Amino acid sequence: RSALSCQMCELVVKKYEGSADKDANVIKKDFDAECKKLFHTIPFGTRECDHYVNSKVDPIIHELEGGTAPKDVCTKLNECP
Numbered sequence: 001r002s003a004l005s006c007q008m009c010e011l012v013v014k015k016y017e018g019s020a021d022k023d024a025n026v027i028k029k030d031f032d033a034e035c036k037k038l039f040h041t042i043p044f045g046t047r048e049c050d051h052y053v054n055s056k057v058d059p060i061i062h063e064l065e066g067g068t069a070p071k072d073v074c075t076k077l078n079e080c081p
Contacts, residue, residue: 001048004039006081008052009074011035012060017070024061028053 008031015030016022031053032046039045056079063073074080 003042003044004048005079006074008035008048009056009060009077009079010070011038012053012057013064013070013073016061017064024057027061028057031057 011031011034012027015034016024016027019027019030021027032049035049035052036046039049042048056074056077059077060073060079063076064070068076071080
């Protein structure tokens with residue numbers, strides 16, 4: 001926490017909102033894709049990734065599912081920024 005957070009939220013969502021599979025499985029995982037490689041050169045990227053797509057992916061998606069946009073989500077969950 002404190003470096004990406006929000007960003008990450010924009011990952012899971014970006015993967016979800018724009019998944020087309022409507023599956024937190026193909027999403028949460030997807031994120032790790034553009035998270036590990038993305039935050040591959042981070043002293044706490046991949047780590048936080050696996051620490052995001054399993055706690056902040058359930059809630060975040062809980063916002064997009066409800067109707068919340070992929071911006072007010074994390075926020076709602078005091079995730080964003």
